[PDB]
Design an enzyme around this catalytic site. Structure first.
Site, PDB file in Angstrom:
ATOM      1  N   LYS A   1       2.729  -1.013  -0.870  1.00 14.73           N
ATOM      2  CA  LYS A   1       3.360  -0.096  -1.839  1.00 14.73           C
ATOM      3  C   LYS A   1       4.739  -0.638  -2.222  1.00 14.73           C
ATOM      4  O   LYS A   1       5.513  -1.011  -1.352  1.00 14.73           O
ATOM      5  CB  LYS A   1       3.497   1.309  -1.238  1.00 14.73           C
ATOM      6  CG  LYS A   1       4.032   2.389  -2.156  1.00 14.73           C
ATOM      7  CD  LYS A   1       2.992   2.790  -3.157  1.00 14.73           C
ATOM      8  CE  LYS A   1       3.570   3.556  -4.356  1.00 14.73           C
ATOM      9  NZ  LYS A   1       4.411   2.818  -5.332  1.00 14.73           N
ATOM     10  N   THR A   2       5.018  -0.698  -3.520  1.00 13.79           N
ATOM     11  CA  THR A   2       6.372  -0.954  -4.024  1.00 13.79           C
ATOM     12  C   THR A   2       7.143   0.359  -4.209  1.00 13.79           C
ATOM     13  O   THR A   2       6.552   1.476  -4.343  1.00 13.79           O
ATOM     14  CB  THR A   2       6.340  -1.641  -5.396  1.00 13.79           C
ATOM     15  OG1 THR A   2       5.592  -0.817  -6.293  1.00 13.79           O
ATOM     16  CG2 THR A   2       5.676  -2.995  -5.309  1.00 13.79           C
ATOM     17  N   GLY A   3       8.459   0.240  -4.234  1.00 16.58           N
ATOM     18  CA  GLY A   3       9.297   1.360  -4.651  1.00 16.58           C
ATOM     19  C   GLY A   3      10.591   0.845  -5.250  1.00 16.58           C
ATOM     20  O   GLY A   3      11.129  -0.144  -4.793  1.00 16.58           O
ATOM     21  N   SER A   4      11.052   1.469  -6.324  1.00 17.57           N
ATOM     22  CA  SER A   4      12.280   1.065  -6.984  1.00 17.57           C
ATOM     23  C   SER A   4      13.032   2.269  -7.482  1.00 17.57           C
ATOM     24  O   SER A   4      12.444   3.311  -7.765  1.00 17.57           O
ATOM     25  CB  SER A   4      12.027   0.135  -8.194  1.00 17.57           C
ATOM     26  OG  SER A   4      11.255  -1.009  -7.842  1.00 17.57           O
TER      27      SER A   4
ATOM     28  N   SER B   1       9.919   5.123  -5.329  1.00 14.48           N
ATOM     29  CA  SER B   1       8.521   5.551  -5.156  1.00 14.48           C
ATOM     30  C   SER B   1       7.883   5.284  -3.802  1.00 14.48           C
ATOM     31  O   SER B   1       6.809   5.837  -3.520  1.00 14.48           O
ATOM     32  CB  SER B   1       7.619   4.933  -6.209  1.00 14.48           C
ATOM     33  OG  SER B   1       8.011   5.463  -7.444  1.00 14.48           O
TER      34      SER B   1
ATOM     35  N   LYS C   1       6.757   8.356  -1.936  1.00 16.26           N
ATOM     36  CA  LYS C   1       5.439   8.927  -2.149  1.00 16.26           C
ATOM     37  C   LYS C   1       4.510   8.765  -0.957  1.00 16.26           C
ATOM     38  O   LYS C   1       3.591   9.586  -0.765  1.00 16.26           O
ATOM     39  CB  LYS C   1       4.771   8.297  -3.402  1.00 16.26           C
ATOM     40  CG  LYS C   1       5.498   8.677  -4.679  1.00 16.26           C
ATOM     41  CD  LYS C   1       5.046   7.902  -5.886  1.00 16.26           C
ATOM     42  CE  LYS C   1       6.086   8.049  -6.979  1.00 16.26           C
ATOM     43  NZ  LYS C   1       5.805   7.198  -8.138  1.00 16.26           N
TER      44      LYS C   1
ATOM     45  N   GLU D   1      -1.987   1.573  -1.729  1.00 15.87           N
ATOM     46  CA  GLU D   1      -2.880   0.763  -2.561  1.00 15.87           C
ATOM     47  C   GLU D   1      -3.382  -0.394  -1.719  1.00 15.87           C
ATOM     48  O   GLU D   1      -2.589  -1.028  -0.987  1.00 15.87           O
ATOM     49  CB  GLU D   1      -2.106   0.224  -3.757  1.00 15.87           C
ATOM     50  CG  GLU D   1      -1.659   1.350  -4.670  1.00 15.87           C
ATOM     51  CD  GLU D   1      -0.548   0.980  -5.638  1.00 15.87           C
ATOM     52  OE1 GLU D   1      -0.171  -0.201  -5.736  1.00 15.87           O
ATOM     53  OE2 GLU D   1      -0.065   1.924  -6.292  1.00 15.87           O
TER      54      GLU D   1
END
Ligand code: CA
Ligand code: CA
Ligand code: CA
Ligand code: CA
Ligand code: CA
Ligand code: CL
Length: 357
Positions: free
Chosen positions: A309-312, A58, A61, A266
């Site tokens: 921002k996280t992403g996994s 993510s 994004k 965010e």
């Protein structure tokens, strides 16, 4: 130096979480430090290096948001216009009432998280959008949605009269010098493509899927993500329109409890407690609808905030933090999907150890 702060924290993190390999970028005024740790593939032991590609999930994004913002700066996309104005195939649907802004802030009427299994291609996706009934008040509720940010990418591509990935490549990645960033890893780079490790210690790699490129499909290096961060921090030399587009991605658009929703990014006012950050990455924020209040004195990008921002994916875990007031940013990529709370803790300890908070 900077490495004296970073190295023990990442060693401790990788040991505690059993992460095979990491790539980390630290962006500061007067420069960027890149560090690589461990193995790109646990089963060959090939080290993480300059060429190692990580799934960022993510975090993709943020690129989708940046392209939308650039279309807006170029005057080709109106963010508050109904999405059906750019995808007339959705005229008469709910997308007469939902905007690109709603899609970029997850406030598109409760649009769901996952692409449904009956949607297998663009045609079946558009048919599904045409029939879908909103379940939340548009612009007053936030539900994290692959469908929504996906549709923003499709809307953007339409407004630019091009296809999503070539357009992204030409207008955003290439100008930022992100030449190790891939939606489809070429044959010649497969030897650089890290293997993921899931929560059970098994190798895994992301599968293609509808809206993959727009929502979760990027494979890239820490260094490339650092270029996007550098530009966000006004430390890059980039074309005026692209810089403006990037700055607009950090405009706050909704208050969502303690979190401010910008364009995918965010953010939180400083000082911020780690518990607040943790709350941003858990079930209650990510998997429930949350009340969202439009910021109507519409804010300018702030200089006193924690932006993240996280992403996994199943086998990977990434995190970006930016502190615009300190002109500092952090990119952490790992080939294990390890807990968001540990991402927050490690980022916070690094940034505190560096004196940036
Ligand atoms: Ca408008
Ligand atoms: Ca499915
Ligand atoms: Ca695709
Ligand atoms: Ca107004
Ligand atoms: Ca702890
Ligand atoms: Cl999905």
């Amino acid at each position: 130096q900077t490495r004296e702060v970073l190295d023990p924290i990442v060693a401790s993190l990788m040991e505690a979480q059993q992460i095979p390999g990491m790539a980390i970028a630290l962006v500061r005024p007067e420069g960027t430090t890149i560090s690589h740790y461990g193995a790109a593939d646990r089963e060959t032991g090939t080290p993480v290096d300059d060429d190692t590609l990580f799934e960022i999930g993510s975090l993709s994004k943020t690129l989708t948001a940046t392209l939308a913002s650039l279309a807006e700066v170029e005057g080709k996309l109106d963010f508050d216009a109904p999405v059906s104005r750019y995808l007339p195939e959705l005229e008469g649907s709910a997308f007469d009432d939902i905007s690109g802004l709603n899609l970029g802030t997850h406030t598109g009427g409760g649009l769901p998280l996952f692409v449904p299994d009956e949607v297998t291609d663009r045609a079946s996706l558009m048919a599904w959008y045409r029939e879908w009934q909103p379940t939340e008040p548009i612009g007053e509720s936030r539900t994290y949605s692959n469908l929504g940010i996906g549709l923003l990418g499709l809307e953007t591509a339409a407004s630019l009269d091009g296809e999503f990935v070539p357009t992204m490549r030409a207008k955003v990645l290439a100008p930022l010098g992100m030449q190790d960033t891939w939606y489809d890893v070429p044959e010649a780079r497969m030897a650089d493509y890290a293997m993921g490790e899931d929560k059970d210690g098994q190798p895994t790699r992301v599968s293609p899927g509808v809206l993959d490129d727009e929502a979760y499909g990027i494979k890239t290096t820490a260094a490339d993500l650092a270029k996007l961060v550098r530009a966000n921090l006004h430390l890059a030399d980039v074309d005026a329109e692209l810089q403006q587009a990037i700055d607009a991605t950090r405009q706050g658009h909704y208050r969502v409890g303690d979190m401010t929703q910008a364009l995918i990014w965010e953010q939180y006012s400083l000082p911020v407690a780690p518990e607040t950050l943790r709350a941003g990455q858990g079930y209650d924020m990510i998997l429930e609808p949350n009340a969202a209040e439009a910021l109507e004195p519409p804010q300018s990008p702030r200089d006193d905030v924690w932006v993240n921002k996280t992403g996994s994916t199943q086998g990977f875990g990434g995190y970006i933090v930016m502190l615009p007031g300190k002109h500092t940013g952090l990119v952490m990529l790992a080939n294990k999907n390890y807990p968001n709370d540990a991402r927050v803790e490690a980022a916070y300890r690094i940034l505190s150890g560096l004196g940036a908070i």
